[PDB]
Chain A
């Protein structure tokens, strides 16, 4: 993925959240960009939060994942819009996707021994594995699991 964005936003009404997401998508499309995936992780319970528009230190927020393929000139505009949006409490940008983190710190041999195409072609979920997912699931993908997952409740 070119760029990833995690948006922590105040859990406003459905119409307001939809309008904010629509504005973000319209800006991304108008700036000559593409959205790989937009997902809503629901309302969670962060350890600490402090709103900026309402100045209320309360722990209630919603998380959203947005994957983009945009150039730097337009990604600057998109980042500015997202950061200046009143609803976006905290936006974090992952730009360390096409290159593994800290290969230079790791070793000089690994500095030029990586292929960016694999990371670019894979989605953000494969780049950063979720706790519930596993390589067991990945191998179950190519094991013809439909014809095998038939006695999973035989006991």
Chain B
């Protein structure tokens, strides 16, 4: 039938597309006081 699409508009994000980026998940890395060892620094905990 017809495809009146424009790659330039798609790449330049005309009409204001939105992607909902990730938040603190990527940024957080935990405490780097020591080295990363298997099972963590305190394997298992009882509350």
The reply to whether A and B meet directly (CB within 8 Å) is no
